[PDB]
Design a protein around this ligand. Structure first.
Ligand SMILES: CC(C)=CCC/C(C)=C\C#N
Length: 119
């Protein structure tokens, strides 16, 4: 998957997830820029939607670390991806919606969705 294809795919998922969740554009922008209000319900739903559409969460919110690895190895070096996966794969959160926002927050420390557009 080329960087240009990932840019495009991200825009597409951002669009469909905005529509699915009804999130304000401002809040979607915040998430895209890596500023995740983890407690905000529609932020959670938006994060969840993007993760599910990339198959990183399955339909029952089972987290799939390999899905993160597949996308992030396009963006950062292999060892950093391993570090990201270790850093982000066992967030201490029982509520699947808060887990989804926390997951996007953690991944976004490494690369934000917005930052992919500059590549
Ligand atoms: C690939 C998916 C599901 C996550 C968004 C992509 C990026 C680069 C940061 C985050 N969160």
């Amino acid at each position: 998957m080329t960087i240009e294809e990932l840019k495009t795919r991200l825009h597409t998922e951002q669009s469909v997830c905005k529509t699915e969740t009804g999130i304000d554009q401002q809040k979607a922008n915040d998430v895209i820029e890596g500023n995740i209000d983890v407690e905000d319900k529609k932020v959670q739903l938006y994060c969840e939607c993007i993760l599910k559409n990339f198959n990183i969460l399955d339909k029952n919110n089972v987290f799939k670390p390999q899905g993160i690895k597949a996308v992030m190895e396009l963006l950062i070096d292999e060892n950093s991806v391993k570090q990201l996966v270790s850093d982000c794969s066992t967030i201490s959160e029982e509520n699947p919606h808060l887990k989804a926002s926390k997951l996007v927050q953690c991944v976004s420390k490494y690369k934000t969705m917005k930052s992919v557009d500059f590549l």
